[PDB]
Amino acid sequence: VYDLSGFTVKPVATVHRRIPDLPDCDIDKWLNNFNVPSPLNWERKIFS
Amino acid sequence: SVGGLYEIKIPTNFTIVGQEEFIQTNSPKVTIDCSLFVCSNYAACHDL
Ligand SMILES: *[C@@H]1O[C@H](CO)[C@@H](O)[C@H](O)[C@H]1NC(C)=O
């Protein structure tokens, strides 16, 4: 009697959930801002 | 021994007592799929 390698049931569908209608982060606009800070006063922006 | 006789307590009445004893002769037959335990469903883990 041979115990064969364990199988897992293959998924029959894919569930993808995202929050809709979220605005664009505009990361490029803040990175391309021409008022660039020095490392002494490095600037932070939080994208969420 | 008073003379040639010793003092002994000899039963004059009796009953029958029952005592249980469990002796383990078997244990659960644990089987491990080492591949499924170590790596679950992951091809990258099964390769390694
Ligand atoms: C033995 O003991 C039982 C219960 O203690 C009693 O009913 C019985 O009469 C006794 N027998 C004798 C011979 O002492």
Curated annotation (Swiss-Prot), chain B:
It comes from the Viruses. Glycans are attached at N13. Mediates fusion of the virion and cellular membranes by acting as a class I viral fusion protein. Under the current model, the protein has at least three conformational states: pre-fusion native state, pre-hairpin intermediate state, and post-fusion hairpin state. During viral and target cell membrane fusion, the coiled coil regions (heptad repeats) assume a trimer-of-hairpins structure, positioning the fusion peptide in close proximity to the C-terminal region of the ectodomain. This is Spike protein S2. It comes from Human coronavirus HKU1 (isolate N1) (HCoV-HKU1). The chain holds residues 785 to 832 of 1356 of the full protein.
